[PDB]
Paper text:
We also report the crystal structure of the [name]/[name] complex bound to the inhibitor Sinefungin. Soaking the crystals into a Sinefungin-containing buffer captured this MTase inhibitor in the SAH binding site almost perfectly superimposable on SAH. Binding involved the same residues and contacts as SAH. Inhibition of the MTase reaction by Sinefungin therefore probably occurs competitively. The Sinefungin amino group quasi-isosteric to the donated SAM methyl group indicates a cavity where the 2′-hydroxyl of the capped RNA is expected to bind. Lining this empty substrate cavity are the residues proposed to be involved in the catalytic reaction: K46, D130, K170, and E203. A good alignment (170°) is found between the SAH sulfur atom, a water molecule present in both SAH- and sinefungin-bound [name] structures, and the K46 ε-amino group. Sinefungin exhibits an IC50 of 0.74 µM, 16-fold lower than that of SAH as reported by Bouvet et al. Preliminary examination of eukaryotic non-viral MTase structures from main classes as defined in Martin and McMillan indicates that the SAH adenine is bound tighter in any of the latter enzymes than in the [name] SAM-binding site, indicating a possible breach to achieve anti-coronavirus selectivity with a small molecule inhibitor of [name].
The [name]-CoV RNA [name] 2′-O-MTase is a heterodimer comprising [name]-CoV [name] and [name]. [name] is unstable in solution, and [name] acts as a scaffold for [name], yielding a stable dimer active as an RNA [name]-dependent (nucleoside-2′-O)-MTase. The [name]/[name] crystal structure shows that [name] adopts a typical fold of the S-adenosylmethionine-dependent methyltransferase family as defined initially for the catechol O-MTase. When bound to [name], [name] is active as a type-0 RNA [name]-dependent 2′-O-MTase, ie., active only when the [name] guanine is methylated at its N7 position.
Author numbering:
A (entry chain A): 3 to 135, 140 to 292
B (entry chain B): 12 to 85, 90 to 131
Write the structure that this text describes.
């Protein structure tokens, strides 16, 4: 386990019908496992991408990736730098944040994410959006409501997402939407394991329910898992970068109509063998 | 304040140099990548290419003009990775400012490059 890039929420815990409790975890601290001169976020996104390497991600020849919450108080985009390192060369990487920052992405969109418009669909959405949080823990709106609509309207069938949540920063519709993927999990990176942070990862988008997920319940389930399974911080996976970049899969991209999307096509989408979207010119707004 | 100090100088690169000579801390939060350290060693590359004697940084975070949000004099760094000699890695922005890439072998003059 200490060798893994992190820990995924086991199926046993996804199946429960837990009540919502408080989380017994402190999001902060000086981090004893981050190697010298390395930012937490480089380490964190590295492990996220190491995890994504183990999944059946679709990887078109002309991949399109959009990154929300890419900026930081430092003024730089460490996560974007990792994405840019991970993804195939000349993959379109677009990133975005509420405040200005410098980026290694092809485009950088400044402003509230609700101002971000595009006609084109994406193969991968990464979000690290976060607002630092009242005596109740309810589904949070804000960027999450935009995100859910974004996913529903602009994620290509076959595409995948990774969205940052914590104890208090989570959304019920996002959890529900996880059941529209061929597979999903909540993934905790090993370098930040003592925080309540996880990435909700949906793998291979299907555009329709596969499971009925109740958001509120699943988040209680998430908390229960975290409370009763402490994870020892670890950066073991950081010390072998040799196989890091995402595999060039050459995943077919096809523009299909709803009536062409039959059982064998869904089966292809489920296995990460197809992306469905147009191949038009990509234009992104303020 | 170093970013402002340079942003509002007629010659930002000179301004940075003067800033250092007077005991200012080098610009921080240059983005060090995790990498193999088995790369080509070249100065500016599509992906991390640090060799055993280098570090790889995200290019934009190592660019004075990017960091200061000012006009470039030309960006050669943004969207790319810059290899920087471990001994100089405390100041990646200064390094790229003071140094020049060889146009034949693609390495840093006085560092990785060995030629005539
Ligand atoms: N509504 C919003 N729209 C756009 N960005 C937001 C919004 N709310 C929070 N954010 C951003 O979420 C970011 C959270 C950061 N911790 C992200 C760090 C960054 N991923 C990194 O690599 O270091 C902040 O930069 C916020 O500006
Ligand atoms: Cl890997
Ligand atoms: Cl549920
Ligand atoms: Cl195929
Ligand atoms: Cl398109
Ligand atoms: Cl200098
Ligand atoms: Mg599968
Ligand atoms: Na319910
Ligand atoms: Zn620049
Ligand atoms: Zn040379």
């Amino acid at each position: 386990q200490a060798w893994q890039p992190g820990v995924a929420m086991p199926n046993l815990y996804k199946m429960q019908r837990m009540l919502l409790e408080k989380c017994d975890l402190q999001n902060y601290g000086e981090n004893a496992v981050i190697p010298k001169g390395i930012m937490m976020n480089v380490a964190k996104y590295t492990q996220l991408c190491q995890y994504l390497n183990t999944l059946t991600l679709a990887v078109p020849y002309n991949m399109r990736v959009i990154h929300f919450g890419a900026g930081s108080d430092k003024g730089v985009a460490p996560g974007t730098a990792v994405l840019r390192q991970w993804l195939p060369t000349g993959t379109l990487l677009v990133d975005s944040d509420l405040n200005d920052f410098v980026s290694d992405a092809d485009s950088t969109l400044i402003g509230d994410c609700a101002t971000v418009h595009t006609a084109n669909k994406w193969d991968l959405i990464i979000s690290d959006m976060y607002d630092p949080r009242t005596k109740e823990n309810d589904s949070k709106e804000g960027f999450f409501t935009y995100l859910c609509g974004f996913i529903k309207q602009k994620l290509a069938l076959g595409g995948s997402i990774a969205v940052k949540i914590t104890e208090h920063s989570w959304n019920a519709d996002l959890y529900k939407l996880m059941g529209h993927f061929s597979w999903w999990t909540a993934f905790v990176t090993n370098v930040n394991a003592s925080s309540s942070e996880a990435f909700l990862i949906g793998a291979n988008y299907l555009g329709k329910p596969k499971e009925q997920i109740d958001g509120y319940t699943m988040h209680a389930n998430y908390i229960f898992w975290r409370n009763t399974n402490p994870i020892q911080l670890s950066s073991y996976s950081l010390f072998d970068m040799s196989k890091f970049p995402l595999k060039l899969r050459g995943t077919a991209v096809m523009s299909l109509k709803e009536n062409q999307i039959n059982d064998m096509i869904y089966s292809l989408l489920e296995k990460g063998r197809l992306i469905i979207r147009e191949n038009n010119r990509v234009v992104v707004s303020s | 304040t170093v970013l402002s100090f340079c942003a509002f100088a007629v010659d930002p690169a000179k301004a940075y140099k003067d800033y250092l000579a007077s005991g200012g801390q080098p610009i921080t939060n240059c983005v060090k990548m995790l990498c193999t350290h088995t790369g080509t060693g070249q100065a500016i590359t599509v992906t991390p290419e640090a060799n055993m004697d280098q570090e790889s940084f995200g290019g934009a975070s190592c660019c004075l003009y990017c960091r200061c949000h000012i006009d470039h004099p030309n960006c050669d760094l943004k969207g790319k990775y810059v290899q920087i000699p471990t001994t100089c890695a405390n100041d990646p922005v200064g390094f790229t400012l003071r140094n020049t890439v060889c146009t034949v072998c693609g390495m840093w003059k006085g560092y990785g490059c060995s030629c005539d």
